[PDB]
Amino acid sequence: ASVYAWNRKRISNCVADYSVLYNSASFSTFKCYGVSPTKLNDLCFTNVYA
Amino acid sequence: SALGKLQDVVNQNAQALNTLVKQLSSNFGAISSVLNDILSRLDPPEAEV
Structure with a gap:
């Protein structure tokens, strides 16, 4: 999407593997706020939005 | 309210x-x-803060 019309997708009712995102070398910027990036698989989340 | 001094303490x-x-x-x-x-959300550099 464009930034003025940014798309939002609900992520729910699934098991999320964040170890394949953080260890991927494709992303030049990966800045997490309020949560450690290596602690993502040890937590369970509600209201996940992308 | 006779025993108010002990009850106050x-x-x-x-x-x-x-x-x-x-x-x-x-x-x-x-x-x-x-x-x-x-301790379950943050890395020790910011969890220390």
Whole structure:
């Protein structure tokens, strides 16, 4: 999407593997706020939005 | 209200204990008041703060 019309997708009712995102070398910027990036698989989340 | 002098001391001590227990619910500017949430959410450089 464009930034003025940014798309939002609900992520729910699934098991999320964040170890394949953080260890991927494709992303030049990966800045997490309020949560450690290596602690993502040890937590369970509600209201996940992308 | 005959025994108010002893009950005043008892109420003051119980209220001081209740205030001391209640002060654990405050985060004091942190992201959470629970230590386990901070230790499970953050890396030690910012969990230290």
